């Protein structure tokens, strides 16, 4: 068939937040940051298999009142000087009955005293499925308060990452 | 036909990021020449513009120093990009041969640091030569300070922050 | 808003240079040569192959459709990448603003694989159909598939 | 290290789109239209017409130089920026490594109005012989006063 | 008991043929074509073990009169897919009795119409040897001679190993 | 034609990979201290999280002739048990020497391994290579080795 | 989480040099000259002819089947070992995700003994069929029969 049927996103945000500090806060250390920042969904951060670098996925455990328990996120190609990256979640009941798996590929610009971010996260809907096209918003929405959120930390205590 | 200037293109690497060395090794390099080098700079001001492209600034020494002082005017500033574009153009500084030196930088971020290539060209007056030293002591010196500079910022996290 | 693309990840025994060539830089060309049925005429209307540059390439008089022009983005032909943009033309239909291809081969053996991303765009306040997506695909899949057979035979052509 | 550099300013009747073209697109070939005693021959062999581009110029055969070769460091055909560089042949000789070339056109009523820069780089530990310079300002400013005279002369031509 | 010093010479080089044609003609087939292009040198190449793949043993003679007489090259490392290999030549007058081995490490790229390249060439010596640089220098005049003609060759002709 | 100067060399152990290769890699730079704290007096990384790119700077001791050396991890396989690690910076390269290359390849054998390891020695230009250099360079190296290996067979636990 | 294995120790009087080149290396070619009246052609479209080679089988004008995908996993023709993969033709029929064939032959006397290990894969969700499997063995045992007693009659073929 016309096998291709997929769903992916790509968005650009521009915040006062040099790049490298978005970066180890929403990609480097996102798993140690979510729990920081929603400290009331998330119960521990922690690497499963890794040393850092690529290779390496992490186990993102929610507090035991949550619907949700973990998410399986891996590394899969880091460039670390230039700020990018893709990633994915590969396993936990995050993925709400619609993907295969969640492929998030990102790539930053440092942009006078803050950054300019391309976002590519790939939802793969799976056979038999129709991925909600109504469950967009909030996929992203998570991630955007989540970044809106560790900004103003970040904006707050300039000394963290910088 | 045209007299031939020297120029300076140098490539610079640092732990500090690119908003930071930008903010102070050009805009403010003026005020941070005296904040940095208290023992040789009296003062650091814009004379005119009011921080804009074509600005002027003026820096004096103390007292006892040779040399009095220096003016420079911004030609062009990206600040965005993080490029500039000066011109050192009076003083005693220049002595006599040389008519303006010219400073082109522009930086890029590099994980955590920062990446910096710099133009610095020396146009000597018409017929007058090129004052070799000028440009050894000129590079000297606009780069000890920058060193000086990035041990203060490294050590400094919350300043151009 | 809406953002319904394609993924490919095509290979085949042809060398990316030649497909680079044949695909991209001059597709608009090509498009002629290969379906002398169905375009009249491929060209530039101004740049140099650079960013900035725009094709228009015009079907048979007897087609229903007129007639598309593609601008170049951004290019790095040495290392067969391409993001091209389908602004204007009769074939693009009122829900579509545009259609957007990116393209990236690499050598493999004594041929190539690549991965296309097509990013098919709605006007403002207009949705997207599957159709319409599913036919650019064919166009274009057969497009290719009509030239891998021409440059598998004729080995000279931008050898 | 020590670089010699020529910046100026330069003014011309001819339209800016017409002057960059000749001297600076298409150069690699006017050079051969406006001096046949000079050069036998000018072409690209590397690139389409874009940044990247290395060209080949070569001289009459009974001329002491040989050939000399350029790239493209950045063309933008739409602000008539380039910077291009000479990076081999017999002028360079052994104490030259190469001459960068940059140059910013605009427009000036139905004319323009320029900024060239040239910096000659010499080999680590060398010197640039200050007339290595005087030679390539001189070589340069009788072409496009050759060119210009022929476009004012011929408004069709790269109009 | 230190081991021997190895000496490594390292290259970056450039063609404008393309490197599918430039790896058959310079690693995959090259025992065939040393013989096409300098005839004058060698008499015959072949393929005495192995099926072209890892593993391969080829031998190549010279001219009768010619004052090296037979080499023997085992390939330890294809992949032909990403233009790299690694072969030795072990067996072979031209092997003076002061080497014991020439380890060649082969990665070629694209780059447009041609290609892009690293070489590495390690010569190794017998038990308590002084690697004389005479031989080294050598061999790599020989085979970048034969670089020269085999591009000028291609270039010429489009279709060899298209 | 400029040369460099290479040995290969081939290993076995009694310690597992996965055990050697965070021992003599990753965190050569501690344990070096932690081996001999009578030549290093710390080993820390300026620049990284542990990746291609990251580098490491060990101190040697007050009295000893040496003062520092920094490495970049040009490549790292964690899973395969292979690296790339550049010795570019410090006293230990005299002015003769432009860098130092590690390229190591371990294997699991048995509840043992072995290892594929080369050094290649890269000089600064016009400037030449006296084994002196390479024959000390190898041998420190391997006492090193030899160290590790006994405190870890002595030690299950550690980088288990 | 299931798959038809099938062991059969076979014996024969031809050496194994030649068993091996005749119902592993050669045999699509072999299919055609003792089956031709079931066979057109056996060829490569994407092989080497040693390890990791595949091979495509196409029968007469009329058989229900069309053609036969074989790759090849790990040869060793030094000792006549050989896994050759089948996931595509039809006759894997909906049921048959692949079918593993494994090769071990031993010299004995003149003549060979051999342990061969067929495989029918089952795509999740699908049947894994009985008499089906069996037709598999009988095809062939009944071919290698043919070509056993070809090989008795002309010796010479394939030293
Ligand atoms: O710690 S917290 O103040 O809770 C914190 C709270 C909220 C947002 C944060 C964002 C980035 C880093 C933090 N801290 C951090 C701490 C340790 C390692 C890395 C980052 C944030
Ligand atoms: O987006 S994340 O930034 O990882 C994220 C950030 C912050 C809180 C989250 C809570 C639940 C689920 C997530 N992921 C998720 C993913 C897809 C759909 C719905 C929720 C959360
Ligand atoms: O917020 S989102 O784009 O949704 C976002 C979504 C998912 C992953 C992100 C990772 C880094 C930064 C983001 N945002 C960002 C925003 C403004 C400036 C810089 C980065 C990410
Ligand atoms: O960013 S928040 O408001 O935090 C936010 C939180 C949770 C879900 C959201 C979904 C869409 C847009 C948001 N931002 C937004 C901001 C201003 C106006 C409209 C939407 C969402
Ligand atoms: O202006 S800077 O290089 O910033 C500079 C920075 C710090 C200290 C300086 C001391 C003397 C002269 C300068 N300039 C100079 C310029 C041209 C010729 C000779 C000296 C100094
Ligand atoms: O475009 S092709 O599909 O190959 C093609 C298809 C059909 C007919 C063609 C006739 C001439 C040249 C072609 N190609 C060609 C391409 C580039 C340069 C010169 C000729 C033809
Ligand atoms: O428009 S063209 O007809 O080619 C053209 C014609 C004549 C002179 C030109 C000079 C500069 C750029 C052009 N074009 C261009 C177009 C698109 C992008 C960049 C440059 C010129
Ligand atoms: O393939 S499509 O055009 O999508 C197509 C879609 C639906 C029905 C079609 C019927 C005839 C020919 C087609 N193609 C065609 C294309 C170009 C010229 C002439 C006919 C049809
Ligand atoms: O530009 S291509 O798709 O490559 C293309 C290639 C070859 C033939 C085509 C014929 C008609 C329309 C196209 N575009 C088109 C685009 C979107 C939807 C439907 C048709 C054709
Ligand atoms: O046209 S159809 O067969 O309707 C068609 C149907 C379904 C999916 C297709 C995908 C690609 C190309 C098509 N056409 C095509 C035509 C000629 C050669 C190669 C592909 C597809
Ligand atoms: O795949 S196609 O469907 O023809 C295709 C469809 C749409 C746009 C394409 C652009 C470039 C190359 C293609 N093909 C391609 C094929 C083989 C290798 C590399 C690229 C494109
Ligand atoms: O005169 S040139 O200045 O070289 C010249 C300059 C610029 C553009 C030209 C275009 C056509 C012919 C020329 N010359 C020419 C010369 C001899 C015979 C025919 C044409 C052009
Ligand atoms: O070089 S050419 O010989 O035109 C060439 C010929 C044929 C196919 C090519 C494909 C891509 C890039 C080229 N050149 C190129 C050169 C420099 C920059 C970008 C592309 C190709
Ligand atoms: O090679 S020429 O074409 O003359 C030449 C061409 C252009 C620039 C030159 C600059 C210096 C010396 C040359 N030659 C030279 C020749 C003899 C004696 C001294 C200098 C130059
Ligand atoms: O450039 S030179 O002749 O070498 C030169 C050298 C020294 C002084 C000159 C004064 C005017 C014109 C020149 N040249 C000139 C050359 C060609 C045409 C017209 C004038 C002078
Ligand atoms: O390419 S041009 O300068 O414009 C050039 C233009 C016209 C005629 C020239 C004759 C000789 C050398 C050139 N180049 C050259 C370059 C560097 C040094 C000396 C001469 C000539
Ligand atoms: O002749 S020169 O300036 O020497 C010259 C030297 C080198 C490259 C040039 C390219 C374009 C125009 C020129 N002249 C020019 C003159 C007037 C207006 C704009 C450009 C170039
Ligand atoms: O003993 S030796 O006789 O020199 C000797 C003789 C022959 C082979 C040897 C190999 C390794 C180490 C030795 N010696 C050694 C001595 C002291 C400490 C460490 C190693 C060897
Ligand atoms: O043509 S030859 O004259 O033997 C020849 C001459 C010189 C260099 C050659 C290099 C590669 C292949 C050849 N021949 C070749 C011929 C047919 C197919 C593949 C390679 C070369
Ligand atoms: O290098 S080869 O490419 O095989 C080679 C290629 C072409 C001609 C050669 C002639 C003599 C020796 C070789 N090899 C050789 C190797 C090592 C040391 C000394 C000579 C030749
Ligand atoms: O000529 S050499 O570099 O010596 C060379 C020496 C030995 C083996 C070689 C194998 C392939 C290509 C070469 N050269 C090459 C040159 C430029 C680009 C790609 C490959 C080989
Ligand atoms: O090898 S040759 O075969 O004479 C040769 C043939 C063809 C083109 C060459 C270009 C540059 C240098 C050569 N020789 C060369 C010799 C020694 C060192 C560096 C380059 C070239
Ligand atoms: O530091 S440990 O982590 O145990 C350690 C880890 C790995 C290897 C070690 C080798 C020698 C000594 C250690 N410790 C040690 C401690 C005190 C005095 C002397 C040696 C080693
Ligand atoms: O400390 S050592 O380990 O020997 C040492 C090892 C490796 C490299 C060295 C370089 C310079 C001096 C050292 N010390 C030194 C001591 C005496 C004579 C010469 C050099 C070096
Ligand atoms: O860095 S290591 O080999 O790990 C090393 C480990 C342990 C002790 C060392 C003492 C001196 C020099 C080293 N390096 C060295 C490097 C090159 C030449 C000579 C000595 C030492
Ligand atoms: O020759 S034939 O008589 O066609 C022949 C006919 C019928 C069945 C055969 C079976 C195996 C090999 C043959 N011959 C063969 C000949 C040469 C090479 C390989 C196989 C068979
Ligand atoms: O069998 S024979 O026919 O004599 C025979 C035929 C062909 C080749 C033979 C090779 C070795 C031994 C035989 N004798 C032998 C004896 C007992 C068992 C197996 C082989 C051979
Ligand atoms: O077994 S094969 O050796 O390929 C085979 C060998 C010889 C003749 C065959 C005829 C038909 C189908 C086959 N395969 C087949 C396989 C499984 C089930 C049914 C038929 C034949
Ligand atoms: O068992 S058969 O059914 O012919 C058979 C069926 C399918 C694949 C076979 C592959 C190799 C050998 C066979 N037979 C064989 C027979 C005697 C000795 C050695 C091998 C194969
Ligand atoms: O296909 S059968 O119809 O069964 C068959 C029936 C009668 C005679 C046969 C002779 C050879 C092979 C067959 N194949 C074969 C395969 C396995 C076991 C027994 C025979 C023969």
Not at 96 to 109: A, S
Not at 117 to 124: C, D, P, Q, R
């Amino acid at each position: 068939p016309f096998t291709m049927a997929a769903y992916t996103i790509v968005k650009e945000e521009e915040s006062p937040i040099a790049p490298h500090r978005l970066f180890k806060a929403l990609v480097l250390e996102r798993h140690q940051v979510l729990v920081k920042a929603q400290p009331h969904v998330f119960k521990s951060g922690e690497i499963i298999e890794g040393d850092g670098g690529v290779g390496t996925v992490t186990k993102i455990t929610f507090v035991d009142g949550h619907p949700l328990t973990y998410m399986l996120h891996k590394f899969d190609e880091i460039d670390a000087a230039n700020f990018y990256c893709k990633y994915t979640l590969f396993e936990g009941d995050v993925l709400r009955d619609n993907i295969e798996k969640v492929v998030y590929e990102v790539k930053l610009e440092a942009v006078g005293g803050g950054s300019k971010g391309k976002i590519t996260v790939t939802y793969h809907p799976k056979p038999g499925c129709t991925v909600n096209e109504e469950e967009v918003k909030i996929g992203e929405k998570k991630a955007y308060e989540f970044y809106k959120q560790v900004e103003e930390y970040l904006a707050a205590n300039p000394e963290v990452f910088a």
